[PDB]
Design a protein around this ligand. Structure first.
Ligand SMILES: N[C@@H](CCC(=O)O)C(=O)O
Length: 259
């Protein structure tokens, strides 16, 4: 049986190939997670179909309906068999789906337009001229919502209250806002995405400050699925064999364009 893989368009994990409208099936896509999916499938002995998550989201539980959206929802409601994506391992997700051990480490970070007078989350929290926000329906937003650390709680209070919204639907939208705002908007995003984007033209953004936390992305399967065990062992093997580092350097180091 062909395994349905849910994933998300998020550079450099999964990207549409150039001129993709002429292409079909898995051949439409490239990136770190496209390469990782082929390795996991080989190691686990399955054929698979990559499917971009219908709503474009990572996955959160709606506070009002208690329904999961995003890739998490596609696993919970049976629409996909596995998620191979930069999906953060979190407590609320682990309650409803399973995760492999991490395939990549990360933490929350800050992107600014070059020259913006901000060095830290504390700097953001103590002023109002520069607006800032996060992605909807992901783990960064939930981090701020739940934090009891004074600086991050002050940031949450500001973000949830801002009108019009400072939250964006896609990472690309957040980055576009950093640029369009001439640096009057800063963006809170994971260090992995920040490190890729800041090294691609136009070379006008930068990462500032230390990471705010330390966590990992995992391969997710529906709770109790027969694939979970083999997928976890495959992640560990690929790490130990050096393959995850090679893919990281293919999609980050080797893609740099900013000198
Ligand atoms: N990796 C995050 C999405 C990106 C973010 O929230 O900054 C997640 O799994 O929700």
């Amino acid at each position: 049986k062909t395994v349905v893989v849910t994933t998300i368009l998020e550079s450099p994990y999964v990207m549409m190939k150039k001129n993709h409208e002429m292409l079909e099936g898995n051949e439409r896509y490239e990136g770190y997670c496209v390469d990782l999916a082929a390795e996991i499938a080989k190691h686990c002995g399955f054929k698979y179909k990559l499917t971009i998550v219908g709503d474009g989201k990572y996955g959160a539980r709606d506070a009002d309906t208690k329904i999961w959206n995003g890739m998490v929802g596609e696993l919970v409601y049976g629409k996909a068999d596995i998620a191979i994506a930069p999906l953060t391992i979190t407590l609320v997700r682990e309650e409803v789906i399973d995760f492999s051990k991490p395939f990549m480490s990360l933490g929350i970070s800050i992107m600014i337009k070059k020259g913006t007078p901000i060095e830290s989350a504390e700097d953001l929290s103590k002023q109002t001229e520069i607006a800032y926000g996060t992605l909807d329906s992901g783990s960064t937003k939930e981090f701020f919502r739940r934090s009891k650390i004074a600086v991050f709680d002050k940031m949450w209070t500001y973000m949830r209250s801002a009108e019009p919204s400072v939250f964006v639907r896609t990472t690309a939208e957040g980055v576009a806002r950093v640029r369009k705002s001439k640096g009057k908007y800063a963006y809170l995003l994971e260090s992995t995405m920040n490190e890729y984007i800041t090294q691609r033209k136009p070379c006008d953004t930068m990462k500032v400050g230390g990471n705010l936390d330390s966590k990992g992305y995992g391969i997710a399967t529906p709770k109790g699925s027969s694939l979970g065990n083999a997928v976890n062992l495959a992640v560990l093997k690929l790490n130990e064999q050096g393959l995850l580092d090679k893919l990281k350097n293919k999609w980050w180091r080797d893609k740099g364009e900013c000198g």
